[PDB]
Ligand binder design. Structure first.
Ligand SMILES: Nc1nc2c(ncn2[C@@H]2O[C@H](COP(=O)(O)OP(=O)(O)O)[C@@H](O)[C@H]2O)c(=O)[nH]1
Ligand SMILES: [Mg+2]
Length: 213
């Protein structure tokens, strides 16, 4: 109406950290949010994920883009800011406030050994040697978020997730969905007025967990 705010949720993650499960759960709770999955976009597609993001932020309808890519490498976050900042004036008028929220899927204190152990067994449980090999490449390129310097200092806010083996029958992606919701209620009350009920979060996560694409 007068000064609408849009949000782009940028994961920093490697394969199998739970990005799509968490974003699917969120989309299941908030059907108006736009979940754009890089895995669904051809490498020779006319519109790539950055183009599809801006297109999915034009209407007064569309406030949230779930940007579903690993962005394990620093340059992959730089691309997002530069490309979107650079094409924003093509589509959005000067009343649109755009915020980038990092969703950090890999704790600061996690070792590569435990990162590998958790994500690899998630994904195995499709030549086996080449799925392993692609996962390794995203880990080799992984540069932890560093909001003290370019480009990560352009984030408006960071949400720190956990990456654990499941304990006490609590999947860490479900723990992570709750963190994101609690964080948004606190720090962006206009995005989520009041929480979904706990059982609706559980059911929406159950839907995401048992998704067989
Ligand atoms: N054990 C466990 N598995 C999970 C969790 N979250 C997601 N998964 C599963 O791990 C696999 C990959 O997760 P996905 O969300 O696709 O990871 P992405 O590659 O980051 O999208 C899927 O089979 C999920 O069902 C979790 O918290 N615990
Ligand atoms: Mg995925």
């Amino acid at each position: 109406l007068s000064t609408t705010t849009k949000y782009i949720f940028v994961p920093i993650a490697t394969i199998g950290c739970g990005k799509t499960t968490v974003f699917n759960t969120l989309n299941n709770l908030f059907p108006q949010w736009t979940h754009i999955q890089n895995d669904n976009i051809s490498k020779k597609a006319k519109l790539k994920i950055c183009d599809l993001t801006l297109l999915a932020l034009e209407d007064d309808d569309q406030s949230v883009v779930l940007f579903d890519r690993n962005n394990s490498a620093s340059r992959e976050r730089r691309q997002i800011f530069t490309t979107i900042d650079q094409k924003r004036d093509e589509h959005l008028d000067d009343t649109v406030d755009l915020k980038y929220i990092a969703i950090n899927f890999i704790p600061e204190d996690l070792s590569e050994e435990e990162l590998w152990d958790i994500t690899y067994n998630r994904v195995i449980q499709l030549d086996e040697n080449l799925v392993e090999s692609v996962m390794k490449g995203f880990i080799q390129r992984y540069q932890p978020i560093n909001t003290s310097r370019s480009p990560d200092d352009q984030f408006d806010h960071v949400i720190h997730l956990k990456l654990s083996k499941d304990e006490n029958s609590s999947k860490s992606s479900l723990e992570n969905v709750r963190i994101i919701i609690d964080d948004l209620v606190q720090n962006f009350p206009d995005l989520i007025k009041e929480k979904p009920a706990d059982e609706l979060i559980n059911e929406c996560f159950q839907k995401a967990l048992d998704y067989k694409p």
